[PDB]
Amino acid sequence: TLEPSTSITLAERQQLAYDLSISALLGDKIYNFGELLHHPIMETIVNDSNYDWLFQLLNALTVGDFDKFDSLIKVQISKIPILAQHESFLRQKICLMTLIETVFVKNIRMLSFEDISKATHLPKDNVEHLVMRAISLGLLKGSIDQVNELVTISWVQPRIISGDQITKMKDRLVEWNDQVEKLGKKMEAR
Amino acid sequence: AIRDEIAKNTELSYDFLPLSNIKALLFFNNEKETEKFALERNWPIVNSKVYFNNQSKEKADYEDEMMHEEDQKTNIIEKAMDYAISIEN
Amino acid sequence: HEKVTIAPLVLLSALDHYERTQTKENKRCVGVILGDANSSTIRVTNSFALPFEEDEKNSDVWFLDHNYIENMNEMCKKINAKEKLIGWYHSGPKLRASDLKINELFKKYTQNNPLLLIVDVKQQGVGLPTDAYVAIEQEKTFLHLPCTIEAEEAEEIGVEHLLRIRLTNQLKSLKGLQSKLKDVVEYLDKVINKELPINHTILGKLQDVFNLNNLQKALTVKTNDELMVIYISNLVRSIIAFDDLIENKIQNKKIQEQRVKD
């Protein structure tokens, strides 16, 4: 975030962004590839010459297609399975955080193996072992249910995205608006 | 008046039953006359469509009617605990 | 982080010299505090004002004399030697370049980070007329430490003699409920719609409260098991309400005895 410090030319900003790109490929820590979008990194580079890898992985999390990003890269980073393993983790971390506040307005905490199967494009057998790997890395806390095919996970790690939870934070206070009358008047009457 | 009495109890007790028990137990003569009783509240008789005839539905979310309720208001429930305020003071 | 504890003697003593100088809204008063900043809980046992002069049309104009500060430190060594300069306070709601640039001036005579204080003269809203703010070198931002009000045994009761149940305790509960409503609606509506400030750094902390009817509907089935303790409280209370009839029946013998004596 520091404008005055680290003053470099335009050509060196692309080389610095290249090190920032390859560093986030091999790990999921500190948000995701979309973190550099708001930072003056992705906006200071060019969208071609294989510098768009940070932008391609932004929509690749929702689409869930590895073949699109694999065709635009080289053999150096594509020969390591860690790239494909941690990329699928960020795709699930978006869905694992939908249990508290993302889409459902009622804040009902529930997840099923069928919903995550369509999001991660994996069968029911692979998604059972995949949830344990995300919890073991210290992402979120919770357990699952194989008998009833249910996944119970809370929400801890914040994201950089906005606009999904803005409407609900006011909607949850609307329920507080209807509670000012009944207990406000009856308490003052005593 | 007889057919308006028996089948009130069949709601909770009887889970399902075909048209044979309707003609026998309730003593109905002509067919398709029960369909006239089936009009508004949607009677696909296959299992249990009741609550049209013989009182009504079970609804849901009963609040602010008579005395104490369940979901929204704890105040009238708390009013029993607050009833000692006017007695002690 | 650290903590702040300020006795009520320090808070009101800072407001007195504000009016004694006939200071209007165009001027503000700046002063220094004393205590022990070494521990994790910052305690302020003393305060002294300063002849602070400021221009209302320019935020870069201020008057601060360190010779009065050097003399004040020498005068305190003869009163309380255990007290050292832990920072400085100031009056007025507004924060301008006058109070921001002088934070490094008091740093020369203060070993720890000077603790900034905004003393509200009108006492507008909630509690805590004075807020304890600390600055970081790494970007600078004003953060508020968990400032609390605590004093000794004789100091807490001393103000009680000068100033001098269940329904009243519930009155403060509703005031805290509206505090949850009014703080979020006014702040969140400022970030959205018109004039988006630079944010999503604070948003991570805001939504950290909402995850854990603000809390959880997933325990609704388990809540009935948690409510059981409340139902248990009514088991004995039904007899406790009947225990009032014990004395009520014993007191019946008194009036019945009065009819015998009459």
Curated annotation (Swiss-Prot), chain A:
<comment type="function">
    <text>Acts as a regulatory subunit of the 26S proteasome which is involved in the ATP-dependent degradation of ubiquitinated proteins.</text>
</comment>
<comment type="similarity">
    <text>Belongs to the proteasome subunit S11 family.</text>
</comment>
<feature type="domain" description="PCI">
    <location>
        <begin position="1"/>
        <end position="158"/>
    </location>
</feature>
<protein>
    <recommendedName>
        <fullName>26S proteasome regulatory subunit RPN9</fullName>
    </recommendedName>
</protein>
UniProtKB/Swiss-Prot annotation, chain B:
<comment type="function">
    <text>Acts as a regulatory subunit of the 26S proteasome which is involved in the ATP-dependent degradation of ubiquitinated proteins. Necessary for activation of the CDC28 kinase.</text>
</comment>
<comment type="similarity">
    <text>Belongs to the proteasome subunit S14 family.</text>
</comment>
<protein>
    <recommendedName>
        <fullName>26S proteasome regulatory subunit RPN12</fullName>
    </recommendedName>
</protein>
From Swiss-Prot, chain C:
<dbReference type="GO" id="GO:0006511">
    <property type="term" value="P:ubiquitin-dependent protein catabolic process"/>
</dbReference>
<keyword id="KW-0597">Phosphoprotein</keyword>
<dbReference type="GO" id="GO:0008541">
    <property type="term" value="C:proteasome regulatory particle, lid subcomplex"/>
</dbReference>
<dbReference type="Pfam" id="PF01398">
    <property type="entry name" value="JAB"/>
</dbReference>
<dbReference type="Pfam" id="PF13012">
    <property type="entry name" value="MitMem_reg"/>
</dbReference>
<dbReference type="InterPro" id="IPR024969">
    <property type="entry name" value="EIF3F/CSN6-like_C"/>
</dbReference>
<dbReference type="GO" id="GO:0043161">
    <property type="term" value="P:proteasome-mediated ubiquitin-dependent protein catabolic process"/>
</dbReference>
<dbReference type="GO" id="GO:0008237">
    <property type="term" value="F:metallopeptidase activity"/>
</dbReference>
<protein>
    <recommendedName>
        <fullName>26S proteasome regulatory subunit RPN8</fullName>
    </recommendedName>
</protein>
<dbReference type="InterPro" id="IPR000555">
    <property type="entry name" value="JAMM/MPN+_dom"/>
</dbReference>
<keyword id="KW-0647">Proteasome</keyword>
<dbReference type="InterPro" id="IPR037518">
    <property type="entry name" value="MPN"/>
</dbReference>
<dbReference type="GO" id="GO:0034515">
    <property type="term" value="C:proteasome storage granule"/>
</dbReference>
<keyword id="KW-0007">Acetylation</keyword>
<dbReference type="GO" id="GO:0000502">
    <property type="term" value="C:proteasome complex"/>
</dbReference>
